Amino acid sequence: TQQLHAAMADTFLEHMCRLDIDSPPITARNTGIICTIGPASRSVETLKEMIKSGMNVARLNFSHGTHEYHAETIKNVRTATESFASDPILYRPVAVALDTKGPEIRTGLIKGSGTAEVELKKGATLKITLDNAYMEKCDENILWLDYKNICKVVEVGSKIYVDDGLISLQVKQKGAFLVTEVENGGSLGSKKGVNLPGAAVDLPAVSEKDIQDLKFGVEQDVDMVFASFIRKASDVHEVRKVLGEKGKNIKIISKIENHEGVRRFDEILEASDGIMVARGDLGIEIPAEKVFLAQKMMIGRCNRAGKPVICATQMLESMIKKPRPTRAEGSDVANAVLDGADCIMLSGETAKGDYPLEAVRMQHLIAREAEAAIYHLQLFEELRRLAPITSDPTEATAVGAVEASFKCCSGAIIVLTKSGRSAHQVARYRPRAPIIAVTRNPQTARQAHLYRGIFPVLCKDPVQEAWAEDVDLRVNFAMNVGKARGFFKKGDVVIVLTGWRPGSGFTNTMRVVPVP
Amino acid sequence: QTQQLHAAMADTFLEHMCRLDIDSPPITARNTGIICTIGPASRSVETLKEMIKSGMNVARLNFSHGTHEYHAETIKNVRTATESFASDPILYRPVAVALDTKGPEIRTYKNIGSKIYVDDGLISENGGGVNLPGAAVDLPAVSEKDIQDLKFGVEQDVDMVFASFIRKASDVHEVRKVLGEKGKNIKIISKIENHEGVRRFDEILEASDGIMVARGDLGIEIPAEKVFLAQKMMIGRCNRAGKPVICATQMLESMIKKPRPTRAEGSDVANAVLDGADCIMLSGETAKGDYPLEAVRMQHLIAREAEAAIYHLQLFEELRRLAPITSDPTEATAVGAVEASFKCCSGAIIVLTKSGRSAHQVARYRPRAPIIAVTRNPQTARQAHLYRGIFPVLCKDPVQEAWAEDVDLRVNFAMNVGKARGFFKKGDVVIVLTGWRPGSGFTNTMRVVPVP
Amino acid sequence: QTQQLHAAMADTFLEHMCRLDIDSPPITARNTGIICTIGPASRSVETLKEMIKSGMNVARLNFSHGTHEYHAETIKNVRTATESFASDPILYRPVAVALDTKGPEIRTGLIKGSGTAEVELKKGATLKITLDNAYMEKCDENILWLDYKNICKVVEVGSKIYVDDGLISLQVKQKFLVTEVENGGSLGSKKGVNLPGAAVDLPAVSEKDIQDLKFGVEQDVDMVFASFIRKASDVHEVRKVLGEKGKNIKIISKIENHEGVRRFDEILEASDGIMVARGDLGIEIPAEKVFLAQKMMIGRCNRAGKPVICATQMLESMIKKPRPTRAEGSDVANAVLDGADCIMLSGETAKGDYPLEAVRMQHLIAREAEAAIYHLQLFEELRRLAPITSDPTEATAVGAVEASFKCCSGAIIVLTKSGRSAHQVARYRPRAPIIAVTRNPQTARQAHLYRGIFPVLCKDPVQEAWAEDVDLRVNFAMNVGKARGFFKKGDVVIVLTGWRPGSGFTNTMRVVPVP
Amino acid sequence: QTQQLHAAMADTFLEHMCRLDIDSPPITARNTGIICTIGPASRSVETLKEMIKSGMNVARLNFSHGTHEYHAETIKNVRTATESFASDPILYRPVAVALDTKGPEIRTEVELKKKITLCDENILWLDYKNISKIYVDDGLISLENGGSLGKKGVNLPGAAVDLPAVSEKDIQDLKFGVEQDVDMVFASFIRKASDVHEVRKVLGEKGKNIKIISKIENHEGVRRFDEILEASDGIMVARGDLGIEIPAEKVFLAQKMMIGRCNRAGKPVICATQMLESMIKKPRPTRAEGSDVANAVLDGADCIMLSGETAKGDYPLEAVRMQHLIAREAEAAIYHLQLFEELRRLAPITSDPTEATAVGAVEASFKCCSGAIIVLTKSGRSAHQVARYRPRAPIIAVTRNPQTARQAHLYRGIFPVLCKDPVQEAWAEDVDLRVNFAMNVGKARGFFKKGDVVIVLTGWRPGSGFTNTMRVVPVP
Numbered sequence A: 001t002q003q004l005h006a007a008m009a010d011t012f013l014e015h016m017c018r019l020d021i022d023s024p025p026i027t028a029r030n031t032g033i034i035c036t037i038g039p040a041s042r043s044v045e046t047l048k049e050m051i052k053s054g055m056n057v058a059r060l061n062f063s064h065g066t067h068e069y070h071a072e073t074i075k076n077v078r079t080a081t082e083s084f085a086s087d088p089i090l091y092r093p094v095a096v097a098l099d100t101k102g103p104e105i106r107t108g109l110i111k112g113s114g115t116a117e118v119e120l121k122k123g124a125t126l127k128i129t130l131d132n133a134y135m136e137k138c139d140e141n142i143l144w145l146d147y148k149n150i151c152k153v154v155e156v157g158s159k160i161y162v163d164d165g166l167i168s169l170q171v172k173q174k175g176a177f178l179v180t181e182v183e184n185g186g187s188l189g190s191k192k193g194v195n196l197p198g199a200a201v202d203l204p205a206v207s208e209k210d211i212q213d214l215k216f217g218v219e220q221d222v223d224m225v226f227a228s229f230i231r232k233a234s235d236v237h238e239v240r241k242v243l244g245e246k247g248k249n250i251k252i253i254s255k256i257e258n259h260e261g262v263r264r265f266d267e268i269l270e271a272s273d274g275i276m277v278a279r280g281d282l283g284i285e286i287p288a289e290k291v292f293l294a295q296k297m298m299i300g301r302c303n304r305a306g307k308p309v310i311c312a313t314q315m316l317e318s319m320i321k322k323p324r325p326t327r328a329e330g331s332d333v334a335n336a337v338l339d340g341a342d343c344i345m346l347s348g349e350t351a352k353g354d355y356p357l358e359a360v361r362m363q364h365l366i367a368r369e370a371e372a373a374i375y376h377l378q379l380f381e382e383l384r385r386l387a388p389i390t391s392d393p394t395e396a397t398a399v400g401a402v403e404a405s406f407k408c409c410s411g412a413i414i415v416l417t418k419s420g421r422s423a424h425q426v427a428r429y430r431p432r433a434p435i436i437a438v439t440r441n442p443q444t445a446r447q448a449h450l451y452r453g454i455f456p457v458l459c460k461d462p463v464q465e466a467w468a469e470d471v472d473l474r475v476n477f478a479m480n481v482g483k484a485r486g487f488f489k490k491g492d493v494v495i496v497l498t499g500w501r502p503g504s505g506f507t508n509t510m511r512v513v514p515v516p
Numbered sequence B: 001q002t003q004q005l006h007a008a009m010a011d012t013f014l015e016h017m018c019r020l021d022i023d024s025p026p027i028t029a030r031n032t033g034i035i036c037t038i039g040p041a042s043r044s045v046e047t048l049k050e051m052i053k054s055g056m057n058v059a060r061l062n063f064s065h066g067t068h069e070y071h072a073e074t075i076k077n078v079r080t081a082t083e084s085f086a087s088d089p090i091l092y093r094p095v096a097v098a099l100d101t102k103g104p105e106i107r108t109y110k111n112i113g114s115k116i117y118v119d120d121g122l123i124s125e126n127g128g129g130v131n132l133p134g135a136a137v138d139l140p141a142v143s144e145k146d147i148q149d150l151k152f153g154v155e156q157d158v159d160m161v162f163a164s165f166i167r168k169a170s171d172v173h174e175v176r177k178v179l180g181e182k183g184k185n186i187k188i189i190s191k192i193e194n195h196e197g198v199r200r201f202d203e204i205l206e207a208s209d210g211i212m213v214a215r216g217d218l219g220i221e222i223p224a225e226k227v228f229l230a231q232k233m234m235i236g237r238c239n240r241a242g243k244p245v246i247c248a249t250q251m252l253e254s255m256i257k258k259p260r261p262t263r264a265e266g267s268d269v270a271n272a273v274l275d276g277a278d279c280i281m282l283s284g285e286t287a288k289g290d291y292p293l294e295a296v297r298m299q300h301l302i303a304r305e306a307e308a309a310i311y312h313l314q315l316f317e318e319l320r321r322l323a324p325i326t327s328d329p330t331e332a333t334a335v336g337a338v339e340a341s342f343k344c345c346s347g348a349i350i351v352l353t354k355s356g357r358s359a360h361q362v363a364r365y366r367p368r369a370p371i372i373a374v375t376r377n378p379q380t381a382r383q384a385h386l387y388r389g390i391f392p393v394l395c396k397d398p399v400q401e402a403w404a405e406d407v408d409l410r411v412n413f414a415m416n417v418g419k420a421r422g423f424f425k426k427g428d429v430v431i432v433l434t435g436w437r438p439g440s441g442f443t444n445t446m447r448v449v450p451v452p
Numbered sequence C: 001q002t003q004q005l006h007a008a009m010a011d012t013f014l015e016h017m018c019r020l021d022i023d024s025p026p027i028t029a030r031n032t033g034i035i036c037t038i039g040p041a042s043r044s045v046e047t048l049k050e051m052i053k054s055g056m057n058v059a060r061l062n063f064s065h066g067t068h069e070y071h072a073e074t075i076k077n078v079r080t081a082t083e084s085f086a087s088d089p090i091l092y093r094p095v096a097v098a099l100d101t102k103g104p105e106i107r108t109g110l111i112k113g114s115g116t117a118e119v120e121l122k123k124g125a126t127l128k129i130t131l132d133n134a135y136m137e138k139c140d141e142n143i144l145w146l147d148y149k150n151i152c153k154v155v156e157v158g159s160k161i162y163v164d165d166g167l168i169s170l171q172v173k174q175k176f177l178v179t180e181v182e183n184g185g186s187l188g189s190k191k192g193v194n195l196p197g198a199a200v201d202l203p204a205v206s207e208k209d210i211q212d213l214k215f216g217v218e219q220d221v222d223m224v225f226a227s228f229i230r231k232a233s234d235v236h237e238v239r240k241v242l243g244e245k246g247k248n249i250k251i252i253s254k255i256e257n258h259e260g261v262r263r264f265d266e267i268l269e270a271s272d273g274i275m276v277a278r279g280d281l282g283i284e285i286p287a288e289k290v291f292l293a294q295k296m297m298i299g300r301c302n303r304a305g306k307p308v309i310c311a312t313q314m315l316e317s318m319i320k321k322p323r324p325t326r327a328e329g330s331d332v333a334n335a336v337l338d339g340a341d342c343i344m345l346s347g348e349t350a351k352g353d354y355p356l357e358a359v360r361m362q363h364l365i366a367r368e369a370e371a372a373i374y375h376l377q378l379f380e381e382l383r384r385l386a387p388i389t390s391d392p393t394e395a396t397a398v399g400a401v402e403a404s405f406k407c408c409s410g411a412i413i414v415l416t417k418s419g420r421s422a423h424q425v426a427r428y429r430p431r432a433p434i435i436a437v438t439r440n441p442q443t444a445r446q447a448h449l450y451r452g453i454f455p456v457l458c459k460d461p462v463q464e465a466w467a468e469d470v471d472l473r474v475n476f477a478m479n480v481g482k483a484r485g486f487f488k489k490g491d492v493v494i495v496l497t498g499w500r501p502g503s504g505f506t507n508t509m510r511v512v513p514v515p
Numbered sequence D: 001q002t003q004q005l006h007a008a009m010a011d012t013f014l015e016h017m018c019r020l021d022i023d024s025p026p027i028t029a030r031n032t033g034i035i036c037t038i039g040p041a042s043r044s045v046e047t048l049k050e051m052i053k054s055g056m057n058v059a060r061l062n063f064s065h066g067t068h069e070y071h072a073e074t075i076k077n078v079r080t081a082t083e084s085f086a087s088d089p090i091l092y093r094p095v096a097v098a099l100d101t102k103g104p105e106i107r108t109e110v111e112l113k114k115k116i117t118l119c120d121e122n123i124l125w126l127d128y129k130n131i132s133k134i135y136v137d138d139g140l141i142s143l144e145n146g147g148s149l150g151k152k153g154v155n156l157p158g159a160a161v162d163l164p165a166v167s168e169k170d171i172q173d174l175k176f177g178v179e180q181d182v183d184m185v186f187a188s189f190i191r192k193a194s195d196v197h198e199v200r201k202v203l204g205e206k207g208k209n210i211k212i213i214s215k216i217e218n219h220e221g222v223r224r225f226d227e228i229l230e231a232s233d234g235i236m237v238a239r240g241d242l243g244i245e246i247p248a249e250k251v252f253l254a255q256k257m258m259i260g261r262c263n264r265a266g267k268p269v270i271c272a273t274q275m276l277e278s279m280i281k282k283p284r285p286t287r288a289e290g291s292d293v294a295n296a297v298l299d300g301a302d303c304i305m306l307s308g309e310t311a312k313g314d315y316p317l318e319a320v321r322m323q324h325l326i327a328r329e330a331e332a333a334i335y336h337l338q339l340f341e342e343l344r345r346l347a348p349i350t351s352d353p354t355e356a357t358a359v360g361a362v363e364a365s366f367k368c369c370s371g372a373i374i375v376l377t378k379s380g381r382s383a384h385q386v387a388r389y390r391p392r393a394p395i396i397a398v399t400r401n402p403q404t405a406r407q408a409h410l411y412r413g414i415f416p417v418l419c420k421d422p423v424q425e426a427w428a429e430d431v432d433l434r435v436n437f438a439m440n441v442g443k444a445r446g447f448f449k450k451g452d453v454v455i456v457l458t459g460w461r462p463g464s465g466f467t468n469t470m471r472v473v474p475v476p
């Protein structure tokens, strides 16, 4: 059970040899699940089923839609979320994330229609213009795109990709205009994304349009921002600046999607609250055979720094049209969890696909299977050897509680936290047991989904005047949540982390107590 | 640096991940074998030439469909395309032929709680070949059609057999008896496709020459969320036993219709190589899809990238600690050669072998450097593709009357092959493995020599 | 350069060795217990006071010699010296008293009617061994009497017989016993005889041991070192003899012969701790094999969490000289590196000329060796080899030790009644000292058997409010640590308490700033 | 149940300790070298024959006392004893001669209870200059301590003595060693790399093949150890003087540090002084002394040394035999699984094919449990490169160079064998002849038998520097 026989192996190779398909996993699923909301999932009715299937974060993509449309999406999520608040013991917080548009390049309209398409045949000629006279009159001869300075960055012989890198063009002759030949062709539609691998796209990291959406998210009380195409640390500083004082508590997740962002990852990770490995654009900007290097590198460096990392894009792509995934997609999710990803994401599988609930359920089943097969003995040993010595009492308390949880096979680590930080410090050491973080801050409970293993619970009872009684109140609530979810039963042992006084920064007490 | 050598010198696996560098270029050699299913999209002589140039090592023919005259024509075109490069033996690549049996599949014969899936797992319990997740084995291991197909393979001189739906050791022995004495040198690769094969894997592996993780049927017979567990389990035990293991099915499925893979497909190929798979396989991507060459090229590029990212310092240590002591001189010589190749950053290990066994025992310990196996046996050269890192070369030169001179001829042939393929150049250091007398079984000599 | 912390952070043991630095000073705290045999050279109140100040934790009484009156006076002098520091509880050091039994010894008679006469034995010469009581006081270079009446039943021709702690060796030539001297030398009175490889059938607990153990219960000793333990049933016999009145006395089994090493696992299971008694052991087995048996027993005791003592000839040359040999400096250091909880002195303190110097040398070596321990490897291995458990105290103990490495704490403070909670911390071998606060004087004395436990005896009365009684004992430990230089105000320490009074309820670990 | 094989398979160091067995007998091969100081107790030819039969590999000559004529007769007696066994080349053991220099010494019975002039208890004479504490007579008296002071040595710890690296007497003694054809020099009180160079310069062209072992005996040599190690052929941990110059409770740190860095560099390290000191007067050692010898071997020392135990004491043969018995037990107790892995990890990757042949040979020897590794070598270098990786099996180094066979004793596990056959015309036949010679030596001394598997290292042409061939070969 829980691959515990493989966990006691002395080598990683023998650990693999002991992986048993008949060793059922524990109940808790530690990996967070982010879901992109769109036409197939934005109804209050479907959203309620997204939550029951395991969605923790509803993602809103501001590459498309108006502020009024997204405001309605946010309302439906919160409506579906609060529809379960009648039972505070089974209530699951749900976070809202805003994915900025960023320096996107998009084509124009095919023959004045949003749905029209033309067939590009390989080897044929195709002209690219910036003259807005063709902005709505693109066809197989001429194509308009919205990057005015595309000629200052594209040398002759360059390659241009259109529509998620499916169409590829080679610039055969530069103009004032661009004369290209189609390498790989096919159906060319309207408003398609363009990638220029190996070109210094001078488009601003934070456009005037992005400024409005960021301030929109601050007004809407979003829990986090996914910032697209972050190339350097100063790009992160603009995002932090625009969010200003009122958006101080909004977590900033930098998306790495090009060569420069990979090269500058350290300065970007230092300034950010988290990372997203956005493999979609990344797979086009750099060779597709190198993406897995960038992913393992970014996940490991984030695990080392104790900052959240998200694995995103095309994880269960085939499930947009089919109710079951391919074998490659099953192993991709599992290996991302084995790599150490805090969260796994879904895009078109939930935004527009035909089986959005099956996708969420499949991600939940695989992640719980992958979490049991993790070789904890080596991971915990390596995280401690790579983590520096600390003078923070909470840090020493966190590593001691994780070590104690491996020793007594505890059902959970219960943590009282106001800002989340205490639970974050436990999570970075990757215990096997789920981390039940008890909080009264709703925003804290929603941002805890970015961390592996943190199962946030929001206590709704009023603050008791006697502080030692307020602590016991929240601890017993955690015991009720854990017993109701089947994390443990009466008589089991659990780790409880508390402070010596109210307020953030005083977590310093670890207790080993039986389940009431 | 190159070949992820900065990540290679890390003291922990986590720090090894942190040092992976997309700007660190891999070496020229690609160690993982590429098995391509040949079908209507790829059975022309002109196409097969491009597939070989793209890196195809093994042509798989799926006997679930097609007549013997059809398959015999496919085999013939495969050998025409293969032998079209024989005029230059420095650059000639052996290409193997594999026969994949139909096996005991239920289609919509019969002699049949709940649970019963149909049409590749498209109905049960509802939904839009037939599988019985967790059921008895009514049909025989080797039916009468399989016997004729297996006998046809011996006649067409195939190098290996992929036996479908192996459930126990006696299934393997049944196949072996059918190949008989005329096909006793044909390698039997047991395909693990159901819960029974996973439960009885150790007895199946012991009876087999190798294993295929056939994830297609496996993902229907057992929960889909468990396939990664059984895959890593079987690759691990095959690595421990030193037997070849193939990862198969839906690795680049979307490339049937599209010229570039998804992100999940790109990481699936890489992680299979990182797991330790000797070979990776393409099915519909090469048999029926619109982009057969691109799929072969993509497996080549990913595999070479992932091989540079292997954490050899942990893998080599753990492979030795788990391997038993030996009295076989070839086994001791082989592990000494691999240790020496790491010590001097060798450009290759050159192995002279008649049956391939000497090269197989080197591949067992997973050197970073390519293993140039020099043989005069054509079947040995073709069967070498089943093993990670073995780059076979077929020596066509006549035997020299002085045995020491004949050894030097074959060694110098491997040197010219290595130079022409960019594995190494003049002045580099290589490991050379030979014996003290002619004949198989006497490999016991390791020499550390500069490339002339 | 401090605490060999540069060597502490190595990735291999070889690199750890390469980084050991003679210019990197150790900390104040010395973790290895020091046991001293008290004798003529050291039994005065004046000398005992200086030995306590020099670092002695345990006074060993060797009941192979002396009367009950003699030992009663020694014990009185030990307690006089100890309690002379009892007026400052912050600085008072508990001192344990250990009784070392005679056990099934074999001794010779008197040389020419004198307990101080001595003859000379020559190589190849013949020596007659008799059991006739007419010679028990009439021994000389021709006839030797010994008190083992069954010796002819257990020896044969060619057997080796060793006399006076292995100095002289004989070989039986005829069966009274006719022998030929192999190695000669001066033969005194009442010397010990070893019969290596013979099946000696003496009782585990003799009538003399019965009287000495009863004396031990009346005199309130803290532990018994039981000589020549051969099997678990020997340990049980000692436990039954001590009975109800001696149930709290710790029983340390001395492993000194071949059967003891062979049956070590069952003996360890029955005992509270182990002494590697290398003196007799090096005569009973080949001396080139002693180091193997020592490292085996220390390893298995560390694995089981039970105290192990390394004993005998650690600083033998300091009996006559003020400074040890290089081999002796190495032996003490390697015993601490092996994992020994305590190191022992015998003749160096019982009868030598430099008893204070010997105690001070062991203190200096042990503290240097403790800094050199490769804690990264040791802590990882003790955890891997320890089973998962449902005991909250064990999980709390391993979390506290892990926390102490994380924040480089100056100490782990533990409140314990019986000692058990501190013993469970010591089993995981933290670098930081373990300050065990107890109100039980016997718990305080017995804690010296465990590496790193620094016991302090709280004298303050019990507070009615239990949370105040707890805070009182924690602050007392804070004052002890500051007064002894383990830490200072602003540092971080680990505190271990329980949720309710009484033994067995330790479940609370706190990371606390030093006020 | 043999050679601590059960403990050898443990997955942790702790479990390795827990599995050590006193009932697990070692092999016959003893890998650690034994160096004996020759003096009035061991000077006679008949005594030296027994010391050789008991395990002495190197005879040490202490040039702090005695005359050139005295030491010359000592050398003649050693060579007389050594060559008395030469009638059988199969069983002959080479014996090396080492010269130990006096070096920068400061020397002076009355009583003293708690006035230096540069012979009574009121004014003492010393031969030195200016410059705190001063130690006299093996550090027993401190200046403050007391004792029976009676031409005793003086130590000035921490200080910087103005005495030259080599003295006029040492120059004469070094030139004497050159004339007497000694195999190695133990250079006393080496403080810096320049001191090693001045010694190497004194030995000149005629003494260029003489191995220089630097003795580390004070604080400065410990701090400048890396530069001294690089310039030297090897290191001696001279714990006698070192234990006076630095606090005695720190000697074990310096010893373990210097053995580790020598093992890491692949250079010989000798642990010396007071290892069996009580055996000067007693036929058996103390428990601390048996532990000290064994822990020196477990630390990784290539050689162990006897001083007064063989030079002046009553039981020299017993002392040599005890070091032999302890060393053999401790070598079986080595945790090879960890040691070999760590040695490889800290060793650099190079292009020298001899080094790559050496690791591959050691790895192969662990895989097939070989009875030996046979190395053909003319300078010793190829055998030294095998020994740095510490195989469990013995290294039979077959040479025709008699100085090489004697110098090989400085390296753990190298069993030197001197071939005296004429050089055969065919190269391949001259190699086969020397290999077969090692097979016979192995069978004679019980290292292996017919049908066993051994590792054989050879090269591709005559002369030194060409070892590149490893073979796994059945014993004939």
Ligand SMILES: O=P(O)(O)OC[C@H]1O[C@](O)(COP(=O)(O)O)[C@@H](O)[C@@H]1O
Pocket: A416, A417, A418, A419, A420, A421, A422, A423, A470, A497, A498, A499, A500, A501, A502, A503, A504, A505, A506, A507
């Ligand atoms: O993780 P954070 O943000 O530091 O908060 C943890 C805090 O929660 C507590 O357990 C309770 O604090 P509050 O009563 O103010 O909510 C404190 O003891 C502790 O300092």
Ligand SMILES: O=P(O)(O)OC[C@H]1O[C@](O)(COP(=O)(O)O)[C@@H](O)[C@@H]1O
Pocket: B352, B353, B354, B355, B356, B357, B358, B359, B433, B434, B435, B436, B437, B438, B439, B440, B441, B442, B443
């Ligand atoms: O791997 P195999 O089949 O054992 O072959 C190894 C043999 O090949 C050899 O190169 C000799 O082969 P040949 O008999 O063709 O000359 C020897 O080195 C060795 O004994």
Ligand SMILES: O=P(O)(O)OC[C@H]1O[C@](O)(COP(=O)(O)O)[C@@H](O)[C@@H]1O
Pocket: C415, C416, C417, C418, C419, C420, C421, C422, C469, C497, C498, C499, C500, C501, C502, C503, C504, C505, C506
């Ligand atoms: O180590 P022991 O013998 O279990 O004693 C530890 C006990 O001491 C306590 O801290 C309290 O001690 P008191 O009973 O003297 O107040 C308990 O919480 C705990 O169970």
Ligand SMILES: O=P(O)(O)OC[C@H]1O[C@](O)(COP(=O)(O)O)[C@@H](O)[C@@H]1O
Pocket: D376, D377, D378, D379, D380, D381, D382, D383, D457, D458, D459, D460, D461, D462, D463, D464, D465, D466, D467
């Ligand atoms: O260890 P060294 O000094 O390099 O000598 C090893 C030499 O021994 C040999 O095996 C034999 O050389 P020789 O003919 O000089 O004895 C050479 O191949 C090799 O170069």
Ligand SMILES: O=C([O-])C(=O)[O-]
Pocket: B164, B191, B193, B213, B214, B215, B216, B217, B218, B248, B249
């Ligand atoms: O047969 C296969 O290859 C499969 O089912 O995966």
Ligand SMILES: [K+]
Pocket: C062, C063, C064, C100, C101, C102, C103, C227
């Ligand atoms: K006694």
Ligand SMILES: [Mg+2]
Pocket: A228, A257, A278, A280, A281
């Ligand atoms: Mg993008």
Ligand SMILES: [Mg+2]
Pocket: D188, D217, D238, D240, D241
């Ligand atoms: Mg000296």
